[PDB]
Structure 1
Amino acid sequence: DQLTEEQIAEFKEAFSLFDKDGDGTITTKELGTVMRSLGQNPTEAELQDMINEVDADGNGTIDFPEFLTMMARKMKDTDSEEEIREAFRVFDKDGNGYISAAELRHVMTNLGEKLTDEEVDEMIREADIDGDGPVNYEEFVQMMTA
């Protein structure tokens, strides 16, 4: 099926987050650094397992063709619940079941998104369906669904 230049560019940008030194491969060391910056604390075994799951030629790192194969295949799946749950956990780093403005700002800055403070407020507000302030899981699911 179609994989446009724009779609590949989006997947390259996702790759580039993990490729911290820009050399074209994701290492276990880089994977753990990013995952900790995103509020998680995986063990060494868990990181190597993740590398091994994507590393199709077994040389110990993930290159972009390997990454693209994995992402393009997942894109064909009609159900995105697991990916949305994982995305929620990245934002909800204290695990209390809702995303605050501070938590959204934190992810924003880590990804280099350069939103203004008013823009941070706006993203939270536009996702806050029930109007109580922060973004809960149901609100996050509804926003992230295609």
Structure 2
Amino acid sequence: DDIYKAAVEQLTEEQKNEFKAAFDIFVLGAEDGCISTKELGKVMRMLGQNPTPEELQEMIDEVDEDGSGTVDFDEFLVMMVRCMKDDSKGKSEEELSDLFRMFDKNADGYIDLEELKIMLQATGETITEDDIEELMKDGDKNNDGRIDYDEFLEFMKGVE
């Protein structure tokens, strides 16, 4: 939601001038003011570094919830600063180990389908049937039918 608006609120005119200079090529005239997202694929390459194209499509779709295909300077700003690294310190590695210890309430050293399933159910979050399997792929990186330390560690890596 507006969380990434708050995250982008750090960068004031200091980078806004550069962003407007980059976006000037986007607004090349001969338009009705709609200002689509067509150029963004190469606009994110104005400096050279580019994240995965699937992430680019996700960035295109997730903002502009009206589907207007109109890129406001605020949404363009937040999507382009997302190219720069933005992580909220990702908890603490020892804190992450403590969180995993809480997760492994079965004291087995591993989390299976039912364990994490019930853990997420306790939150009451609406979970689809197309889900659960998605989380299985997210966790069972080794495809060994359980969640090991490394699978959780990369699973939650850099997330806060």
TM norm structure 2 = 0.41
Larger helix fraction of residues: 1
Higher relative contact order (CA 8 A, sep 6+): 2
In the superposition, the TM-score normalised over structure 1's length comes to 0.44
CA radius of gyration, larger in = 2
